[PDB]
Structures are given as structure tokens and as C-alpha cells.
Design a protein around this ligand. Sequence first.
Ligand SMILES: *[C@H](C)[C@H]1/C(=C/c2[nH]c(/C=C3N=C(/C=C4\NC(=O)C(CC)=C4C)C(C)=C\3CCC(=O)O)c(CCC(=O)O)c2C)NC(=O)[C@@H]1C
Ligand SMILES: *[C@H](C)[C@H]1/C(=C/c2[nH]c(/C=C3N=C(/C=C4\NC(=O)C(CC)=C4C)C(C)=C\3CCC(=O)O)c(CCC(=O)O)c2C)NC(=O)[C@@H]1C
Ligand SMILES: *[C@H](C)[C@H]1/C(=C/c2[nH]c(/C=C3N=C(/C=C4\NC(=O)C(CC)=C4C)C(C)=C\3CCC(=O)O)c(CCC(=O)O)c2C)NC(=O)[C@@H]1C
Ligand SMILES: *[C@H](C)[C@H]1/C(=C/c2[nH]c(/C=C3N=C(/C=C4\NC(=O)C(CC)=C4C)C(C)=C\3CCC(=O)O)c(CCC(=O)O)c2C)NC(=O)[C@@H]1C
Ligand SMILES: *[C@H](C)[C@H]1/C(=C/c2[nH]c(/C=C3N=C(/C=C4\NC(=O)C(CC)=C4C)C(C)=C\3CCC(=O)O)c(CCC(=O)O)c2C)NC(=O)[C@@H]1C
Ligand SMILES: *[C@H](C)[C@H]1/C(=C/c2[nH]c(/C=C3N=C(/C=C4\NC(=O)C(CC)=C4C)C(C)=C\3CCC(=O)O)c(CCC(=O)O)c2C)NC(=O)[C@@H]1C
Ligand SMILES: *[C@H](C)[C@H]1/C(=C/c2[nH]c(/C=C3N=C(/C=C4\NC(=O)C(CC)=C4C)C(C)=C\3CCC(=O)O)c(CCC(=O)O)c2C)NC(=O)[C@@H]1C
Ligand SMILES: *[C@H](C)[C@H]1/C(=C/c2[nH]c(/C=C3N=C(/C=C4\NC(=O)C(CC)=C4C)C(C)=C\3CCC(=O)O)c(CCC(=O)O)c2C)NC(=O)[C@@H]1C
Ligand SMILES: *[C@H](C)[C@H]1/C(=C/c2[nH]c(/C=C3N=C(/C=C4\NC(=O)C(CC)=C4C)C(C)=C\3CCC(=O)O)c(CCC(=O)O)c2C)NC(=O)[C@@H]1C
Lengths: 162, 162, 162, 172, 172, 172
Amino acid sequence: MKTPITEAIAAADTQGRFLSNTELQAVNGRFERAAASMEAARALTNNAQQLIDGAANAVYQKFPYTTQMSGANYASDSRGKSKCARDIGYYLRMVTYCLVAGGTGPMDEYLIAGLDEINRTFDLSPSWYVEALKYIKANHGLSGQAANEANTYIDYAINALS
Amino acid sequence: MKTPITEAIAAADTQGRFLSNTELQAVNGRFERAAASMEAARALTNNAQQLIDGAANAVYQKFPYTTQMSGANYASDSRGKSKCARDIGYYLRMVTYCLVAGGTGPMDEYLIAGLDEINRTFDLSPSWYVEALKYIKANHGLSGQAANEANTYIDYAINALS
Amino acid sequence: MKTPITEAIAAADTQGRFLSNTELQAVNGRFERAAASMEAARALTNNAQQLIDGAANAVYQKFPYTTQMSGANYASDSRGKSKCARDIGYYLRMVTYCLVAGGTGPMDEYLIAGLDEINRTFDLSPSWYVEALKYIKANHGLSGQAANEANTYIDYAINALS
Amino acid sequence: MLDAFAKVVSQADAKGEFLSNAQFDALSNMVKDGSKRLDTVNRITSNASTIVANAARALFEEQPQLIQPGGNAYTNRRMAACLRDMEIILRYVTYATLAGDSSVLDDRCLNGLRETYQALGVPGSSVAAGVQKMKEAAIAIANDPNGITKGDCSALMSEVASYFDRAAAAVG
Amino acid sequence: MLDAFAKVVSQADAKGEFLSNAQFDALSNMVKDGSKRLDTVNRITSNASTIVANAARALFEEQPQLIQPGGNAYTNRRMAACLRDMEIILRYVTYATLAGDSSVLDDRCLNGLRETYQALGVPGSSVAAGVQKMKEAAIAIANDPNGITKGDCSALMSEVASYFDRAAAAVG
Amino acid sequence: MLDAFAKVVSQADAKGEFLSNAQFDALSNMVKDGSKRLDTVNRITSNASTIVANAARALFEEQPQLIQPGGNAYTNRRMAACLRDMEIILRYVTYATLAGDSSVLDDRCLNGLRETYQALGVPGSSVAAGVQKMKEAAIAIANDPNGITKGDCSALMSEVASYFDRAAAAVG
Ligand SMILES: *[C@H](C)[C@H]1/C(=C/c2[nH]c(/C=C3N=C(/C=C4\NC(=O)C(CC)=C4C)C(C)=C\3CCC(=O)O)c(CCC(=O)O)c2C)NC(=O)[C@@H]1C
Ligand SMILES: *[C@H](C)[C@H]1/C(=C/c2[nH]c(/C=C3N=C(/C=C4\NC(=O)C(CC)=C4C)C(C)=C\3CCC(=O)O)c(CCC(=O)O)c2C)NC(=O)[C@@H]1C
Ligand SMILES: *[C@H](C)[C@H]1/C(=C/c2[nH]c(/C=C3N=C(/C=C4\NC(=O)C(CC)=C4C)C(C)=C\3CCC(=O)O)c(CCC(=O)O)c2C)NC(=O)[C@@H]1C
Ligand SMILES: *[C@H](C)[C@H]1/C(=C/c2[nH]c(/C=C3N=C(/C=C4\NC(=O)C(CC)=C4C)C(C)=C\3CCC(=O)O)c(CCC(=O)O)c2C)NC(=O)[C@@H]1C
Ligand SMILES: *[C@H](C)[C@H]1/C(=C/c2[nH]c(/C=C3N=C(/C=C4\NC(=O)C(CC)=C4C)C(C)=C\3CCC(=O)O)c(CCC(=O)O)c2C)NC(=O)[C@@H]1C
Ligand SMILES: *[C@H](C)[C@H]1/C(=C/c2[nH]c(/C=C3N=C(/C=C4\NC(=O)C(CC)=C4C)C(C)=C\3CCC(=O)O)c(CCC(=O)O)c2C)NC(=O)[C@@H]1C
Ligand SMILES: *[C@H](C)[C@H]1/C(=C/c2[nH]c(/C=C3N=C(/C=C4\NC(=O)C(CC)=C4C)C(C)=C\3CCC(=O)O)c(CCC(=O)O)c2C)NC(=O)[C@@H]1C
Ligand SMILES: *[C@H](C)[C@H]1/C(=C/c2[nH]c(/C=C3N=C(/C=C4\NC(=O)C(CC)=C4C)C(C)=C\3CCC(=O)O)c(CCC(=O)O)c2C)NC(=O)[C@@H]1C
Ligand SMILES: *[C@H](C)[C@H]1/C(=C/c2[nH]c(/C=C3N=C(/C=C4\NC(=O)C(CC)=C4C)C(C)=C\3CCC(=O)O)c(CCC(=O)O)c2C)NC(=O)[C@@H]1C
């Protein structure tokens, strides 16, 4: 994936040169930031379940028709609610991963590429996931730079869906 | 090979997409026309031998030198007159083919690609074949739109040779 | 390799055509001078040892530091002396080759491609080889046109080195 | 690529022959049902999303391991690819259907594909199962009595099925 | 690509050597026939249209099946490709002839050709029959005594033969 | 390509899992030696010219056939290319060093190198000897206690050795 290290390497390798000091500087920037990144990733991981369930519910409350309307795309039955819970986990797992790589690479490769195509084809509204993300953000219970890291990736997802 | 169908398909495939109503219309145009196309093809096929014979004599009248002059490229001897009749039959077969296919594709693939280089290398006057083609046009006996279908393809050969 | 003949061929091959008068004219221009060209090469070849030894000294005289400073790139010792003579003989061989062949291709291919990168990497001074070349120029003792030939190639080395 | 007309022309030209009476009739036969064939393409065509989604959706119920984390349809990039392959095969079947000849479906789609799906890890068994579902759905839609001049299209619907089977076999 | 000069240069360089007395003789000796060499290329070249035409005409007579419908030189495309190929081989023959070395023949024309004809279905032996007819016409024109200071060109004509045969051998 | 972080992420995502305790530990440990890792890269990089040139000069002393006429490093184009190969390999060793994973060294430099060498007549074994000499030099420079906070880099020097050994092994 695009991680800050593989991007330094790709940039030196494109120009066929040894790593710049510019690049070494950058990778150390990622070493500094790494501490606020692992803090968030560990916490999101340990509260995964309550966060997924929490965000599901918030979406069912915001968009009540998703539990009431007929359709393979909706969460009116047990099959759809469980597709939805899974999809929300996915988003959370991807944020985890961004924090650990120190970039959007994982989310970009595993989820975002093809995202607009999938949502049109299976007729899922981006706005459901926006809401799940806003819930995760408002309820991770982190502060300082750990918060900043997590919210930057989550907002990234949210920009992806807008 | 270029038929109106293979064109609509290549059109659609180049934009990596399903056939349009534009294309399905086009193809219906070939279907509507087919009646007048097949008709002429039948008659040309039936009268092939008299048309060919007639065509070669049209050519010898217009170009008497072609029966008198020495050289492997003229029809002064049995061998040349047979090359000439063979060739004339090829042109007519190609008209046939065109009618059947719904466009020039067969004449284009089998006869026109390479035509200019053949006629130069072997010192065959394009004029000669134009006369033969004019005789066919004047002597096929078709009328209405069958005539028209035949004439379009004959005139298509004539233009290639001018 | 660029000889005037392979260049003639390449030109004509690149335009997909037979060789022209322009090109046969040329090649004759080469075939006539092959005369001088070949005797120059014989003269340089017969006196190669005395020209290499003489030239290496010329260089050691104009740049005495090169026999005194230590370091791999100098001729302070026996190894370095031997590299330097070797290199000078490479230059003389190449002029031999160019003469035989009717142009620079041998020299261009076997010596000039990469030359600058080698002199930087191994920290050899182009100046030194210019002196050796000028000594060969001045002490082949050819006159007139057998000289004119030999000298254009020496001067082509000097220009490569500038 | 060849349509039915061009195929007859191409073999006639290899023998030096004008078209025989039979050949003229055989060909005359195709233009007859041509209106039928146009309904089939148009109908398959204007329901192609449906047919692609509902065959994939059903594929993934029968083969859960495809959409499991690690499975070959997991990630939206692979999932869009998988949907894409399905749209494509549908596409080339509709082309073959307009042509009356599987030439285009063999040249531009099928020749090479099995080798590609192996080099890639694409489970080829499942694409085949995929195409089976498309085929039923598209024939059913094509061959639906409602909203059309009624008549018999079973030559076509058998022609269409052979193209599907043929995709299934090329990867299966 | 090597002319005869460059070829000797190239094989001395791999040996680290100034040219031996021999080598200087060989090359000077070749340069004798310089002017004749140029006559040979000039004559062959400036008859190339005829040489190609007569040889192909003569070939299609001896091997009718080539121009029968379904045969390989039938259709004007194929006939033009077939004439092109013979023009091309004759072209490389003149090239190698100017050069005193078959490298350019082998590198740019011949290396990989048999495999292309076998891929396409081009009767390679037919091609060689063609090349052989080109050969005799070419040399006859080359060695012809009219219009030129007389002398011995028998060496050249065997060299030119060798290049033609070399090309026949690469396909036949 | 992967770095050490992305490698963990990708095998987590194939299995569907959030990262584990064990896994966060490991990845947190790569951030411990980050500063040292940067020194290694910087020190090898800041001495690339020297390492390459000295290694190559040593290679040609042990194996003089490379530097005789006809030899593979003879003529300036080949010596340049030889030096360039030494540099590329080093370059790729420094990338894998910064990444914490051999993936880029294998994928973009080593995959199919041996095959290219065999086809070209580059003595693979001679390159592996060159690589061997760049290893000793690069590690000496990287692990020299002057001009740096004293500390243990034995793990990192072991890794860096491993990247060279891979390169030697893939050509030699
Ligand atoms: C939740 C907020 C709402 C909801 C969810 C829902 N989703 C699906 C089906 C799919 N969701 C995905 C998502 C992904 N696939 C991936 O691989 C990734 C990245 C790793 C993502 C984000 C996809 C591709 C599908 C379709 C394929 C599949 O079944 O997995 C459904 C079922 C849709 C159907 O037509 O079968 C549902 C219900 N729906 C709601 O109403 C909730 C509010
Ligand atoms: C007839 C109008 C005049 C004429 C005929 C003549 N033609 C040739 C030889 C050739 N004719 C063709 C034509 C075709 N070959 C193809 O494949 C096609 C399309 C399918 C065509 C139209 C070709 C290629 C040749 C040369 C090769 C061959 O022999 O088949 C000749 C003999 C030429 C020769 O030099 O041998 C002649 C005499 N000449 C007249 O005087 C008529 C008025
Ligand atoms: C002599 C004028 C001065 C001198 C020479 C010197 N040269 C080297 C080393 C090299 N010389 C070459 C040159 C070439 N290699 C080729 O293949 C060609 C074209 C055919 C040329 C012209 C090269 C490549 C090298 C380096 C590789 C090798 O050893 O062959 C040295 C030794 C340098 C070293 O670092 O070992 C020396 C000393 N030096 C002087 O001081 C003389 C005045
Ligand atoms: C869906 C039912 C199944 C599935 C499919 C799948 N395919 C790929 C990869 C490719 N698909 C093709 C095939 C074609 N490309 C064309 O242009 C044509 C002819 C017009 C066809 C038929 C190709 C070439 C590729 C590779 C390039 C690409 O990805 O675009 C993938 C992705 C694999 C990956 O690693 O990215 C997938 C997922 N997957 C399943 O599991 C289903 C059974
Ligand atoms: C076959 C699967 C089913 C079926 C077909 C059927 N269609 C017709 C007649 C027509 N179909 C069309 C449609 C088109 N013509 C076009 O030009 C285009 C594209 C622009 C299309 C899609 C038309 C115009 C007709 C003619 C007029 C009419 O309203 O019928 C028939 C009648 C026979 C014939 O071939 O003409 C039939 C049988 N009917 C079924 O019940 C099958 C299940
Ligand atoms: C003529 C005596 C015979 C004949 C020839 C024939 N050749 C082709 C096709 C090709 N021949 C070549 C050869 C070359 N192209 C080059 O660029 C070079 C080197 C400069 C050569 C020597 C190639 C590559 C092709 C394929 C590409 C092309 O067609 O231009 C054909 C055509 C095959 C077809 O199916 O179209 C033919 C007919 N065939 C005979 O019957 C004669 C004995
Ligand atoms: C050999 C197959 C036949 C032959 C050749 C021959 N030619 C000459 C002499 C000359 N030929 C040329 C030719 C050229 N020089 C050029 O610059 C070019 C391209 C522009 C050509 C075509 C020239 C200029 C001469 C010299 C003057 C003259 O008219 O003679 C000879 C004479 C001996 C020699 O080697 O020079 C010969 C033998 N003559 C035959 O009898 C063969 C059939
Ligand atoms: C030096 C110690 C030895 C040596 C090397 C040598 N290599 C080549 C040519 C090539 N080597 C490569 C390698 C790479 N190219 C890349 O881009 C990469 C990764 C990005 C690698 C690893 C390639 C591709 C070539 C061939 C193409 C080219 O030259 O660029 C040569 C030149 C061979 C020639 O015939 O000119 C040489 C000399 N030679 C020795 O003797 C040493 C043992
Ligand atoms: C290991 C091979 C050798 C060694 C290294 C070592 N270095 C440090 C400390 C630091 N190294 C750096 C270097 C950088 N940080 C950057 O951002 C950049 C790119 C511009 C570089 C090159 C820094 C900033 C430090 C910290 C400050 C300092 O000067 O110490 C250590 C200390 C441990 C740590 O994790 O920091 C060590 C051990 N020591 C040896 O003896 C080996 C030979």
C-alpha cells in the first residue's frame, strides 16, 4: 500500500536515486506520530464490538426506514442488520489499519477503490455510513493527538462518501 | 469483416458498453434492406457466366489493343483472356458477397486492399476493370432497389479503380 | 557499429527502400580513402609500443604529480603505470580501428560511450588523455593525407575528452 | 469477428464460389427472425444491471467463501471487478446474439480467459456458476410472453443458451 | 550491424589486438572489388521491380495453387504481402552485398522468419523457390558484360549467391 | 511493495481480523529502532560512491578476466553498466532497510535478474562477489561507533546483511 515509507521509496525509485534526506525527515515524522497512532488503534480495537453495535443503532435511529422498508439493500430483517453490522466493522477495521500504517493506504486499497461502484450497484446510501462514522468519532473517548489521528482517518472515510 | 452488424458491435465494444437503440435501429435498417440485397445477389449469381463473358467482350471492344499487343499482361492469347475472365468473375463474385453481407467488407478485404499495388506490379490498367464493371451495371437486368443495391457496390468498385 | 556503409544501409533501411546513388556515391568516397586510411593504421600499428611508451611519458612529463601522488587513480607505482599505459594503448587501438572501418563507430562504441562516467568514478583526469593523444598526433610522422586521416580520429578523441 | 452472413461469405471465398441456393436460403432464414433477435438483445440489454446484480447476489449466497475476508470477491476493488466480469460476459453474449455467430464472444472475451483466471487466483468454477444464473435470468426475461407480439422464439432462446454455456465452459 | 571491416574490427577488439598483417591484407583486398561491388548493387537495385515481378510470375506458374482461391497468395492483400516479402528479401540481399557481410540480412530480415511463416501458414519452400528465381535473374543482370569496363566479378557473384541461398535456407 | 507495518496490516485483513496484542507490540518495536534505521540508510547512502567504487576495484583485482579485452566489464559502456548494477543493488538494499521488509528488493530489482544475466552473459557469480564486498563495507560504515550516540544495532546489521545475502543469492 501507500504508507509513508513506501511513498518515500516510490519517490526515490521513480527518480532512480538513493533516499533523500527529505525522505528520511518524513519517515521520522511518521515515527514521531506513530505513538498517537498506536494509542488510537489499540482503543478502537478493544472497543470494536460496542462501537460497531453503537454505530449500527445510531444509523437505525437516524434512518428508521432502513429497518422498516422491504429490499435486499435494507436492514428490515436479520440478514440485512448483520450485513450492516459487518459493513460498519469493516470501516472500523480500516481506520484501525490506517493508524497502524500511518496512512490511508489500507482504506484506499481495501475499501475505497470500487466504493462508489458497490454503493450504486447494491443500492446502499453513503449517508448511512457517514452516520456510523460520526458516531464512532463522537464515542471513541480519546483525546489529545490520539483523537486527532483517529478523526483524521474517519473524516477521510466521510469525505470518501461525500 | 465489415458488415453493418459487426460495425454496431465494434462500435459498442470500443466504448466497452452494451448495444444501443441506435445500433439496434441500424441493424434493423440492414434487415429491411436485405430483401433488395439478396434479390440482386441471386440474379447476378444466376447470370454470372453471361455477365462475365459479356464484360470481357465490353473490355476488348473498348480497348482492342488488349487483344493485339504482346506481353503477359494483355489478353492476346488464350492465357491472358482467361486471366481476364477469371479476374472479372472475381470482381462480380465480390459484388455478390457485398450484397449478401450488407456492405463493402468482403470486397474491401478480398480485392481492394492491395489493389493499387497489384495493378501496378502486373501493369494491369484499372480502366479495363471499370469498363467491365460498367457492362455489369448496364446488363444485370435488375430494377427498383435491387438495381440500386447492385449499382452502389459496382460504383463502389469503380471509385476504387479511379 | 557506425561505418559509412552500415550508415548507408541504415538510412535506406529506415525509409524502407533500396540504396540510392546518393548512398553508393558516398560509399565510393569511403572506398577511395580506404587507401590512406589503411596505411595510417599499419603505421600506427607497427610503432604502437614506441608510441604508447612515448605518449605515457609525455603525460608523466606534463603532469608529474601523476607519478608522485599516491592513490589508486595515479601512476605513483607499477600497477598505476601499467593501467595508464594500457589505457593509452586502448586509445591508439581505437584510432587503428576507426581507420580500418572508415569512421568513428569503433571508438564511439568501445570507448566514448560511458567515458565521462568512468573518468568521474575512477577520478581520472581527461586532460591526461588529451596530452597522450597530442603526443601520438605529433610523433606518428605521417604526412599529407595518411596523416589527415589518422589526425581527424585523434582530434575526435581529443574532442570527446573536452 | 464474423456475423452469420460474413461466415458464409468467408467460406464461399475460400473455395472460389458464388453462394449456393441453399446458402442464399439459409441466410434468408436469419433475416426472418431478425425482429425477434432485436427484442432479445434489447430486453437482455435493458435489464442488464438487474441480471448482473441478482446473479452475483445469488452466487455469493451459494458460495459464502467468495465474500469472506480473504475470499476472491472480498474488498470493493475485487467486488467491482467480479461484477465487471459478469457485465462483460453478458455484454459479449448480447453481441454474439445480434451477430448470429459466437466469433466475437470467442475472440475478444473467451480466448485467453481461463489462463488469466488461473494466473490471478480467480475461482473459475464460480464464474461458470455465475454465468448459469445470468443465462436463466436473461432467457426468462427475453422469452417473456408479456408486452410483445406473441410468437415462437425458441430457436433464438436455444441460440442464446449455447453462448452462455460456452462462456461457462471456457472458464469452468 | 557489421560490414566486413567492422566485423574484423569487432573480433580484434574482443581479443585486445591490433590487426595482424593478414587482417590488413584481407580488408585492402576487399577494397579492390570496391567499384565492382558498387556496380553489382546498382544493377540489381535498379532492376528490382522486374526481378521481383518475373520471379513471382515464374513462381505462380510453377505452383498454381498459390493463386487458386483459398491459396496463400490469393486476394490482393496476400498477393501484395507476398510481393513485398520478395522485394524485402532482395533488399536485404543488396544490403549484405554492399556490406560484405550477411549480418544485416540475418539480423533484420531472417532471424525469426521461419517461425512467422509457420505461424501464418506461408509455404516457406514456395518462398525459397521464389528466392532462387530472384537469385539467377539478379546475378545474370549483375554479371552482364554490356555497358561496363570488363574484368572479373566471379568472386562477387558467389558472395551474392551465398546471400540468396542463405535466405532460401532460412525459410525453405 | 510492503513495509513492516503494511505487511502486518495485509495479513490481518486477509483473515478479517483486527490487530492483536502481539502484533501491536511488534510494530511498536519497529518504531523503537526507527532512529537507528535512519542512520543506517543515511550512512550507507552518504557513502554509496565509495562502497560501489571500492567493491568494484576489489572485484576486478580478484577476478581480472572481467577487465581484460573481451571480458564482460571491458569497454566503457559495460564498465558503466557494471558500476550501475552495483549501485542499483545497493539502492534496493537501502530501500528494504528503510522499509523493514525485503519485498521491494525482490519485486523491483531481483525478480528475474539471474535470467537477464544468463541471457546477456553477465557472470552472475562475479556480481554476487561484488555484492558480498559492498555488504562488508556498508555494514562497517553503518555500524561504526564514531559520530553517533552509542547503542546496539546488531539486529539491524543482521537484517542489512540479510538483504545483501539475498541479492548475492538471486544472481550468483
Ligand atoms: C448499514 C449501515 C446498512 C446496510 C448494509 C448492507 N450492506 C450490504 C451489502 C454490501 N456491503 C458491502 C460492503 C463492502 N464490501 C467490502 O468488501 C467492503 C470493504 C472491505 C465493503 C464496505 C458490499 C460489497 C455488499 C454487497 C456484497 C455482499 O453481500 O457482501 C447489504 C446487503 C445488500 C444486498 O443487496 O444483498 C446490506 C443490507 N443496509 C441498511 O439498510 C443499513 C442501514
Ligand atoms: C482483363 C480485364 C484484362 C487482363 C487480365 C489479366 N490479369 C492478369 C493477372 C492478375 N490479375 C489479378 C487479379 C486479382 N487477383 C486477386 O486475388 C484478385 C482479387 C481477389 C484480383 C482482382 C492478379 C493478382 C494478377 C497477377 C497474379 C496472377 O497471375 O494471378 C493477367 C496476367 C498478368 C501476368 O503478368 O501474368 C492478365 C493478362 N489483361 C487484359 O489485357 C484484359 C483487358
Ligand atoms: C594514464 C594516462 C593515467 C592513469 C590511468 C589509470 N587508469 C585506471 C583505470 C581505468 N582506466 C580505464 C579505462 C578504460 N577502460 C575501458 O574499457 C576503456 C575503453 C576501451 C578505457 C579507456 C578504466 C575503465 C579504469 C578502471 C577499471 C580498470 O581498472 O580497468 C587507473 C587505476 C584506477 C583505479 O582506481 O584502480 C589508472 C591509474 N593514471 C595516471 O595517473 C596516468 C597519468
Ligand atoms: C465474479 C463473478 C468473479 C471474480 C472476478 C474477478 N476478476 C478479476 C480480474 C480480471 N478480470 C479480467 C477479465 C477480463 N478483462 C477484460 O477486459 C475481459 C475481456 C473484455 C475480461 C473477460 C481481467 C483481465 C482481470 C485482471 C485485471 C483487472 O483486475 O481489471 C478480479 C480481480 C483480481 C485482483 O486480484 O484484483 C476478480 C475479483 N472474482 C470472484 O471471486 C468471482 C468468481
Ligand atoms: C421473442 C423472444 C418473443 C417475441 C418476439 C417477436 N417480435 C415481433 C415483432 C417485432 N419486434 C420488433 C422489435 C424491434 N424492431 C426494431 O427495429 C428494434 C430495435 C429498434 C426492435 C427491438 C418489431 C418492430 C416488430 C414488428 C412489429 C410488431 O409489433 O410485432 C414478433 C412478430 C414476428 C416478426 O418477426 O415480425 C415476434 C414473435 N414474441 C414472443 O411472444 C416471444 C416470447
Ligand atoms: C510470396 C512469394 C509468398 C507469401 C508471402 C506472405 N507473407 C505474408 C506476411 C508476412 N510476411 C512477413 C515478412 C516480413 N515482414 C517484415 O517486416 C520482414 C522483415 C523486414 C519480413 C521478411 C511478415 C512479418 C508478415 C506478416 C505481416 C504482414 O502481413 O505484413 C503474407 C500474409 C499472410 C496473411 O494472412 O495476410 C503472405 C501471403 N505467400 C505465398 O503464398 C508466397 C509463396
Ligand atoms: C562486375 C560484375 C562487372 C564489371 C565491373 C567493373 N567496374 C569497373 C569500374 C568501375 N565501375 C564503377 C562503379 C561505380 N563507382 C561509383 O562511384 C558507383 C556509384 C555512383 C558505381 C556504380 C566505376 C566508377 C568504375 C571506374 C571507371 C570505369 O568506367 O571503369 C571495373 C574496372 C576494374 C575495377 O575494379 O575498377 C570492372 C571490372 N565489369 C565486368 O566485366 C563485370 C561483368
Ligand atoms: C558488474 C559487477 C558486473 C557486470 C554487469 C553488467 N550488467 C549489464 C546489464 C544489465 N544489468 C541489468 C540489471 C538491472 N537493470 C535494472 O534496471 C535493474 C533493476 C532496476 C537491474 C538489477 C540490466 C537490465 C542489464 C541489461 C540492459 C542494460 O544494459 O541496461 C551489463 C551490460 C551488458 C551489455 O551487453 O552491454 C554489464 C556489464 N559485468 C561484469 O563483468 C560484472 C561482473
Ligand atoms: C546504529 C547503526 C549505530 C547507532 C545509532 C543510534 N542512533 C541513535 C539516535 C539517533 N539517530 C538519529 C538520526 C536521525 N533521525 C532523523 O530524523 C534522521 C533523518 C534526518 C536521522 C538520520 C536521531 C535523531 C537520534 C536521536 C538523537 C541522538 O543524536 O542520539 C541512537 C540512540 C537510540 C534511539 O533510539 O534514539 C542509536 C543507538 N549507535 C551505534 O553505536 C551504532 C554504530
